[PDB]
Write a protein that binds this ligand. Structure first.
Ligand SMILES: *[C@@H]1O[C@H](CO)[C@@H](O)[C@H](O)[C@H]1NC(C)=O
Lengths: 39, 49
């Protein structure tokens, strides 16, 4: 593959600190606080 | 045959054809070889880093 070809030549990708399931829990808090409390 | 490197030789699954000696990936790097004395196709993978 190509993502593996880049890795073997010193080019690697670090993972983000917040997982996509942690960002999706931050969004729910904004949605749940807006509906039940407003601004 | 002078192709020097460091890697993990395995048994390659690539469908080499009688005229094909080496193999190359999408980045033009030697990805397979042919044994000079046994005519077996070996898949080369770099050691972990
Ligand atoms: C000699 O090399 C040939 C290919 O050049 C190979 O087919 C053959 O088996 C070898 N004979 C040996 C290692 O005795």
């Amino acid at each position: 593959d190509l993502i593996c070809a880049q890795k073997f030549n010193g080019l690697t990708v670090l993972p983000p600190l917040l997982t996509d399931e942690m960002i999706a829990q931050y969004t729910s808090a904004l949605l749940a606080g807006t509906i039940t409390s407003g601004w | 045959n002078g192709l020097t490197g460091t890697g993990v030789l395995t048994k390659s699954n690539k469908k080499f054809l009688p005229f094909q000696q080496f193999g190359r990936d999408i980045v033009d790097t030697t990805d397979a070889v042919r044994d000079p004395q046994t005519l077996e196709i070996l898949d080369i993978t770099p050691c972990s880093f």
